[PDB]
């Protein structure tokens, strides 16, 4: 459905925040030079899951398959539509007469 | 001595506007100045190839003699506008059928004189003599009731009936499309 679409755009928009946060939190290292050289864990696993998320509707966006073997759309071609060649058209027929020249 | 029904010149402009790029044919069953009762088509575009042509027959000499009808006449109407001279392929066919019955006569829809309501009976009969196919003569009167006739197949046409219609090489495609088209027969009954 369409509703894939819209799903990975608030991944990106989760991503996105992720990134916010871990700009701040750079910040917070930046102003406390402490040794911490750690990220929260609530951001990691927040970036983690919006790649989750994100990767799973990426993959329906991505499209849908074609199957390999020629046969497969030319099934439902019927004589009456190969027949017709369209640059050979003629227009000596009945239709003309018939219908309102 | 050739008699159709108006159903059956409603059919015949059916089929001819159903596909008319296309050259057509068919046939006419009759009970046993013959009386075609009733009429049946088949195929369209190329009709020189034999094995439809015989599978065809097959099958419209087993419907009509499970129901007690036989075939006694062959329908084909040409592609070109300036065409009103029976194929080889007409000719053929015509003269295998009337092996049969020697009141099986061969009928032309002459696409010259094909119009909306029309106007002048399209259709020309040939019969078969001196070993010999030639047309009757045109001035004979061929449908039952012409006027019904013209306004039956005016209605129909204006009625977008048919690209409903199903001939046979539809049921070819898919049999789920009823090749005997009873549903043409009960437009005709309630429009009459
Ligand atoms: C993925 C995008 C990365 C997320 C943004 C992270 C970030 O770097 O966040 C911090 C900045 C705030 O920078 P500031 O204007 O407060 O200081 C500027 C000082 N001054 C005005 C003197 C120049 O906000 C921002 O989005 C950075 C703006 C440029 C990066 C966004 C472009 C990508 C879309």
Redesign the interface.
């Known amino acids: 459905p369409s509703l894939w679409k819209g799903l990975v755009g608030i991944g990106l928009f989760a991503l996105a925040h992720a990134a916010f946060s871990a700009a701040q939190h750079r910040s917070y290292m930046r102003l406390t030079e402490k040794e911490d050289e750690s990220l929260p864990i609530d951001i990691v696993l927040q970036t983690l899951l919006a790649f989750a998320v994100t990767c799973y509707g990426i993959v329906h966006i991505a499209g849908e398959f074609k199957d390999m073997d020629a046969t497969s759309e030319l099934k439902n071609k019927?004589?009456?539509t190969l027949?017709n060649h369209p640059s050979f058209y003629?227009f000596?027929?009945?239709?003309?007469?018939?219908?309102?020249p | 001595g050739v008699k159709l029904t108006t159903q059956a010149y409603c059919k015949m402009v059916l089929h001819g506007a159903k596909y008319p790029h296309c050259a057509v044919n068919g046939l006419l069953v009759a009970e046993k100045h013959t009386l075609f009762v009733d009429c049946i088509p088949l195929f369209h575009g190329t009709l020189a190839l034999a094995p439809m042509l015989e599978v065809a027959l097959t099958l419209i000499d087993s419907w009509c003699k499970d129901h007690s009808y036989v075939i006694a006449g062959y329908y084909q109407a040409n592609e070109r506008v300036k065409d009103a001279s029976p194929n080889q392929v007409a000719e053929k066919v015509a003269s295998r059928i009337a092996e049969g019955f020697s009141d099986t006569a061969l009928i032309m829809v002459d696409n010259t004189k094909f119009t909306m309501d029309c106007v002048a009976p399209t259709i020309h009969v040939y019969e078969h003599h001196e070993n010999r196919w030639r047309c009757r003569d045109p001035h004979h009167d061929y449908c039952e009731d012409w006027p019904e006739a013209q306004r039956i197949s005016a209605s129909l046409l204006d009625s977008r009936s048919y690209e409903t219609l199903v001939d046979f090489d539809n049921h070819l495609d898919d049999i789920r499309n009823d090749w005997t088209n009873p549903e043409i027969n009960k437009a005709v009954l309630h429009l009459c």
């Open positions: 019927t004589f009456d027949r003629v000596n027929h009945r239709g003309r007469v018939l219908f309102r």
